[PDB]
Design an enzyme around this catalytic site. Structure first.
Site, mmCIF file in Angstrom:
data_model
loop_
_atom_site.group_PDB
_atom_site.id
_atom_site.type_symbol
_atom_site.label_atom_id
_atom_site.label_comp_id
_atom_site.label_asym_id
_atom_site.label_seq_id
_atom_site.Cartn_x
_atom_site.Cartn_y
_atom_site.Cartn_z
ATOM 1 N N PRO A 1 -5.846 3.570 0.587
ATOM 2 C CA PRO A 1 -5.681 3.062 1.978
ATOM 3 C C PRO A 1 -6.951 2.479 2.476
ATOM 4 C CG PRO A 1 -4.473 5.089 1.738
ATOM 5 C CD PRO A 1 -5.149 4.832 0.424
ATOM 6 N N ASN B 1 -2.044 -2.564 13.323
ATOM 7 C CA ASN B 1 -1.150 -3.240 12.400
ATOM 8 C C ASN B 1 -1.019 -2.465 11.106
ATOM 9 O OD1 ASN B 1 -2.414 -6.570 13.373
ATOM 10 N ND2 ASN B 1 -0.650 -5.490 14.099
ATOM 11 N N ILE C 1 -0.837 1.141 -0.183
ATOM 12 C CA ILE C 1 0.191 0.884 -1.222
ATOM 13 C C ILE C 1 1.214 1.997 -1.066
ATOM 14 C CG2 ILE C 1 0.741 0.661 -3.608
ATOM 15 C CD1 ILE C 1 -2.243 -0.207 -4.019
#
Lengths: 114, 114, 114
Positions: free
Chosen positions: C1, C97, C64
């Site tokens: 991340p 986001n 991911i």
């Protein structure tokens, strides 16, 4: 909506009122209330466009909807216009990446917009 | 194409010519003319990778096409190579996000690429 | 991340240990090993949220997998909570986001995760 401008123009060349102008014009263009528009200007950057360092900008517009072919042409005319007029950046040295965000993929106020 | 590197390496450690080298190597790698390649390097950042503040980089490569599995492996070898050689960053402390942008979602020169 | 926070809160207001706290809490929340978590905090920015320059943050979380409606709600509660407690930013002046990256579109260590 969220609009980010990264530029090699120096801070002192960013005019007073520019963040408000961006906010205002984006609310109009996207049709979204100005309370929901966020803007971010990053001057003094180490950047090149096409191999040279005349004034340039790399930008992003994120919105939940209100993104598409015609709309994005209209946004580009608006935003390149503002960057030319206010920051003296040539429109052919601006890139703007447009993102249509899913509401579930936008966090705000401890939750998402979904 | 647009390539952005955010790093905790100090500005003085970024060699003179690095933006031009990135431009040239990305033009060669992507097959796009150098005139369309924009590069942006952001040193001196407050960042950590795996909890550590040893040198690291968080990067993005945006292109209209020329993005995919094999291509992105090649780009990663190229770009980690360059960041190791020029900025002394270990490849295992670099992330690169790849984005295959739709032409209609890239603004330039008062319109889009569509 | 990868978690990025851009904020108009000044650097001196970012408490010592903040990047580590983010790393730790993101590892827990995403289930990913801390070694794969990257964090990036960018203070002193020229930004506005709803036309106002009161403290605000514009953020991104890339991962991911481990991205989705419920997961992103939970991240937003975590992350807005940390921005409120540590940086004194109101949760309703934060956008995050979220991006579910394909492994083939993340470079790391001379290759990709695919």
């Amino acid at each position: 909506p969220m609009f980010i401008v990264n530029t090699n123009v120096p801070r002192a060349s960013v005019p007073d009122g520019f963040l408000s102008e961006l906010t205002q014009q984006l609310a109009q263009a996207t049709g979204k209330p100005p309370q929901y528009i966020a803007v971010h200007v990053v001057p003094d950057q180490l950047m090149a466009f096409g191999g040279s360092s005349e004034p340039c900008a790399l930008c992003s517009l994120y919105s939940i909807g209100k993104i598409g072919g015609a709309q994005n042409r209209s946004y580009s005319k608006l935003l390149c216009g503002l960057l030319a007029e206010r920051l003296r950046i040539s429109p052919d040295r601006v890139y703007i990446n447009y993102y249509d965000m899913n509401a579930a993929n936008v966090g705000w106020n401890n939750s998402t917009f979904a």
